């Protein structure tokens, strides 16, 4: 309910960027700010409500590493979330294109930035539910001498609670295992999975596997792979622990990363 209604006349739709979860995403302009326009598919009212819920919740938080949500445009039957365009796009796509050339120090800066934003959300007691490399956007590349990367975590889109089992399974291994059959504990697991994804240059474990085989992995409660670095491995394994209450707080995660 508490979100800004963007007028259709204030937005200009440019190029199609990709399909998202129940969406098509376009570059746009907001009268001018550079934005993305997330056009909801024709949906049951409960999906639209979950879409509105995200826009409302995201409009009331602020963080240097959270992408802005400008509001929602209702254009006839259409529902369009209007969010900040982040210059260099998704981290996973970028890492895959740049693989082999990204130092561990760079990855540790990015990790700390993400842990900072999630520590703030944990404090606000706000569930994200879609922490993954595709949703970490690069505002600054930080490869050049004297530079440092700068990320922004985007909104979760249609809230996890409204999605089907099939699309929850597709979100494995970022999806917390307790969510397969809503606590901020789930974002600790997504963080851990995103750290693995980053360490492996944008390739998450279990992505060459079928949906039924991802589901089976969780049902057997197999442990996800560890990175080579034992301190980093200690943190990822702690985050990627099946019992949610055994996952460390983001205050603790943040402290551990700062020493790395």
Ligand X SMILES: Nc1ncnc2c1ncn2[C@@H]1O[C@H](COP(=O)(O)OP(=O)(O)OP(O)(O)=S)[C@@H](O)[C@H]1O
Residues in contact with ligand X by CB under 6 A are 17-18, 20-21, 23, 25, 36, 38, 67, 83-86, 89-90, 130, 134-135, 137, 154, 156-157
Nearer to ligand X, 40 or 232 (CB): 40
Q: How far is it, in rounded angstroms, from Cα 85 to Cα 57?
A: 19
For residue 69, list its beta bridge partners: 83
79, β-bridge pairs: 74
Long-range pairs for 30-37: beta carbons < 8 A, 24 or more residues apart: 30/6, 30/70, 30/82, 33/70, 33/84, 33/85, 34/84, 34/85, 35/11, 35/70, 35/82, 35/83, 35/84, 35/85, 36/82, 36/83, 36/84, 36/85, 37/11, 37/13, 37/73, 37/80, 37/81, 37/82
Nearer to ligand X, 25 or 196 (CB): 25
| Residue whose Cβ sits closest to ligand X | 20
Least gap, CB of 90 to Mg ion (angstroms)? 8
Cβ 156 to Mg ion shortest distance, Å: 8
User: Choosing among ligand X, Mg ion, none, which partner's interface includes residue 18 (Cβ < 5 to 8 Å by kind)?
Assistant: ligand X
Nearer to ligand X, 137 or 240 (CB): 137
Q: Helix 185-199 vs helix 104-123: angle between axes, to the nearest 10 degrees?
A: 170
- The site partner of 187 among Mg ion, ligand X, none (C-beta below 5 to 8 Å per kind) is none
Which residue, 158 or 195, is less far from Mg ion as judged by CB?
158
Pick the closer one to ligand X by CB: 17 or 61.
17
Which CB sits closer to Mg ion, 79 or 135? 135
83 binds, among ligand X, Mg ion, none (CB under 5 to 8 A by kind): ligand X
Sites for Mg ion among residues 149-168 (CB under 5 A): 154
Quick check: 68 and 4 in contact, CB under 8 A? no
By CB under 5 A, the residues from 206 to 245 that bind Mg ion are: none
Q: Which does 85 bind (CB under 5 to 8 A by kind): Mg ion, ligand X, none?
A: ligand X
Spell 191-214 as b/e; 16+ CB within 10 A means b. bbbbbbbbbbbbbbbbeeeeeeeb
Token reading at 168: 């929850």
CB of 255 to ligand X, least distance (A): 29
Site residues (vs Mg ion, CB under 5 A): 135, 154
């Amino acid at each position: 309910l508490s979100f800004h209604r963007v007028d259709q006349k204030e937005i200009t739709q440019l190029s199609h960027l990709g399909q998202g979860t129940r969406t098509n995403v376009y570059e746009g302009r907001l009268r001018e700010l550079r934005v993305v326009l997330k056009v909801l598919d024709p949906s049951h009212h409960d999906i639209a409500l979950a879409f509105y819920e995200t826009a409302s919740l995201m409009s009331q938080v602020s963080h240097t590493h959270l992408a802005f949500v400008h509001g929602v445009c209702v254009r006839g039957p259409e529902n369009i979330m209007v969010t900040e365009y982040v210059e260099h796009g998704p981290l996973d796509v970028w890492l895959r294109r740049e693989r082999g050339h990204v130092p561990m120090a760079w990855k540790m800066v990015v990790a700390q930035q993400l842990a900072s934003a999630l520590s703030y959300l944990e404090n606000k007691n706000l569930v994200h539910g879609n922490v993954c490399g595709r949703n970490i956007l690069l505002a600054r590349l930080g490869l050049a001498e004297g530079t440092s990367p700068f990320i922004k975590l985007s909104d979760p889109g249609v809230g996890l609670g409204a999605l089907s089992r099939e699309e929850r399974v597709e979100r494995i291994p970022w999806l917390a295992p307790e969510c397969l059959p809503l606590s901020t504990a789930m974002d600790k697991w997504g963080f851990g999975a995103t750290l693995l994804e980053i360490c492996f240059d944008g390739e998450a474990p279990l992505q060459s596997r079928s949906p039924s085989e991802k589901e089976h992995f969780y049902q057997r409660q197999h442990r996800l792979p560890e990175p080579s670095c034992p301190q980093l491995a200690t943190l990822t394994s702690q985050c990627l622990t099946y019992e949610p209450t055994q996952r460390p707080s983001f205050r603790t995660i943040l402290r551990d990363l700062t020493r790395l």
